[PDB]
């Protein structure tokens, strides 16, 4: 194509948008406003109580979702800074419309780095697991694939595929697949837009759209977009938002925002090393024990290896003249540094090298893919952590616990989803209903933000339409998932216990 | 010549320093390395468990020292960005040597903003309280002030003044005043240098030196520097470091680093607004209730000016329309914004206006001088919080609790300070001592980082010297304060309970 970042770095907003002209400084200020909105957001504060690798941890020295997101933000800064430095060295900065958008470029990366994870549920993957597994038993999306049933097994009478040829059956398929396909990424878009009503710039929202697969997607993903459509990137409830976002950022269907690959790279780069640091701190293994696990896990290599210049290098450096520090602290400092100094430049280069496809958002790979020795180093760290950190019984037990907690909470609120459309809308209208004490009482438990979202969405539906009862139930289930995913590891754990009368 | 920021923004280090020439990019990378060191520092991670206004808070929506420090960092960024923008308008950027140091200028501010609370003890003005009160009743610095004296209440036989006269008594005075003058700011310098061995750039360290008063200062004086010397800025244990730092940053005795004023301004601006937001969240009062409390200090002598421009503007903007925006959330959003838009420019201008004195580090005021209507707005927020947030029984209760906890821990470890020099050094040598089981076990409880610091310091002392026993006791007390101040609110609370055999 013709790479013009002015066409992608969009400073307009969905609501009460800044309009027309705006100087270099004026545009900077717009993006700086987004930083303030995001940093002061309770959604980001909530991260210091959301788990990363070690659940419900009471050691501050261990990373939370917030401290991790903060570290990712620095890797993202370094990558963005290096992309711009090279583009300036290639003279291509002015040529790519970036000469006046240097600051926004950097800031967008840094902020979408802090905001990846914003939509993650209480017990991470076990939160995703519990939510989807609970919904999957309720409405079976398995049965919605063909045209009849003859059973369907979907408990929801409205959502069963009657029968009895209907184009309305397509909505049922979409709704059933979408509700069983909760993803932190998809929930993130829902969160920043529909639920938090942060009025971020279009460019800032494009940065947190990591995947391009619609949650309701049922088939095999297109060969050309297999990677970008890896996981669901957005829900049915956002289809319209995503559609305006696509227009506002000049994105093709299922195409990604150009700055996302920067953020994505920064994410992989920082959790790997970090997770091993935390394991040593928890006392899962010693720094010497870790070094031996890494040496095992590596190809061999060793002759003309990256292992030598990175992990071996950090190991030797941390043995002596580490007397001016401490063996383990010194090791991780060098390991981080060496990894960054080799991977950040590669990522930066990779971005610039494949910039036409990346810009188009059609590029079907990550910045640090298979074929590179660089990519292999990252895989090494991941493999060691999988085999020796994640496999730890105390970690695994909390994962099992988390799953029980989330599943339990879903079952606790189940009666709200069990109510009839008329009875539920009666509960929505007259806040407290006489014949439904328990139901009204929970309904009140749901965060006002989440409840308004339901009201707002359902209000926009045409009541007369035969689609209406199906849409209402979709949004009612969405409301519930929003509440649950919204909670911290700790709040979910407490709420579950308080509502079981075991506290 | 005169204002030359090249002479203040020092990229050199204490240990293994980068040397000679360096590219604008190369220097950027040096300061970016500091970001990485600070962000990945466990000392910063520990902040997500240290308290800000509401102690041991179980709601993630309430700020911790880390989330607040993060917010200060953004205000600092905006102030830094505005100072540079205006200097660029004025054409003074090239003239002040800043043309090539734009990034470091901003980064140094941002980082010293994030690190501003690094040295704060658990609880934490109550930690300072408990630490100083505990030490004051052990070694009364009260009696050391005057000529010796004769019956000084100092329990420490060594540190007791003569009856009698000597110049070694001056060391006793210095040691007794210093140990009773713990201050988070002074502990921060100790932390980044002696304890964490971060090896930041000289400029980066100068940024966290908020006060220029030596902890041991006994003098009532000295007008000209009465503001800069408000609180202790460094301990006796870092007198030498501070001396090298003074040389490296071309600072006069008791003169401050030019960028500190920026960081300082951001911290005040941020805390006032955030604490009122948190109070509303903690349901201490409603947003309506808050508006009425503010509509008191006003002052309606204006009658339609700054209060009407900021807080009345935020109040009116919060009423009606919203668009899934809760009146509570949108009010604080506008209050913050309006405050920033009026105070950040003032601070930025104040800095530029008094730049000669601020550069020299002789400027005896903060950027928000009491005289300004701007300064008054900040006082309004503070006053509302003082008489309606900080006065809350639950807050006050935790404060009382915190004080008992810290005092308790100090009394728990008291036997280590009770040991003779020979016995304590025997304990330091043969890690385990048979004749001292409790003392042995307690010594082991102390952080290895902290323990090494004692060893390293005492090793450097000349054993033959009559100063040696006094210096050893100073470093022994320092070691203890290091341990205690090092803990989070939670760790201190747990440790106290575990060591009371009540857990
Ligand atoms: N405890 C634990 N058990 C596990 O089995 C496990 N697997 C991974 N991790 C943690 C360690 C890391 O902190 C974290 C990264 O999360 P993610 O899997 S969301 O990674 P992305 O790059 O975001 O892929 P995506 O597109 O899906 O977002 O996974 C785990 N932690
Ligand atoms: N609950 C409570 N009770 C109190 O009595 C109190 N007093 C203040 N605060 C809290 C509210 C604020 O969030 C916090 C500010 O801390 P600070 O700024 S004082 O610390 P430094 O970095 O040393 O700068 P400086 O020394 O010049 O003040 O104090 C309090 N909080
Ligand atoms: Mg202050
Ligand atoms: Mn991540
Ligand atoms: Mn503060």
Swiss-Prot record, chains A, B:
**Per its UniProt record, what CDD domains does this chain match?**
HDc
Q: Any idea where the HD domain is?
A: 65-272
EC number(s)? Answer: 3.1.5.1
A molecular-function term among this protein's GO annotations = manganese ion binding
- This protein's superkingdom? Bacteria
Q: Which cofactor does it need?
A: Mg(2+)
* Reactions it catalyzes: dGTP + H2O = 2'-deoxyguanosine + triphosphate + H(+)
Q: What is the enzyme's class at the highest EC level?
A: hydrolase
One BP term from GO: nucleobase-containing small molecule interconversion
Q: Which Gene3D superfamilies match?
A: Hypothetical protein af1432, putative deoxyguanosinetriphosphate triphosphohydrolase like domain
Which PANTHER family would you find in this protein's record?
DEOXYGUANOSINETRIPHOSPHATE TRIPHOSPHOHYDROLASE, DEOXYNUCLEOSIDE TRIPHOSPHATE TRIPHOSPHOHYDROLASE
Q: What does this protein do?
A: dGTPase preferentially hydrolyzes dGTP over the other canonical NTPs.
| Family, as annotated | Belongs to the dGTPase family. Type 1 subfamily.
Listed under subunit, the entry gives:
Homotetramer.
Q: What protein am I looking at? A: Deoxyguanosinetriphosphate triphosphohydrolase
- Source species taxonomy: Bacteria, Pseudomonadati, Pseudomonadota, Gammaproteobacteria, Enterobacterales
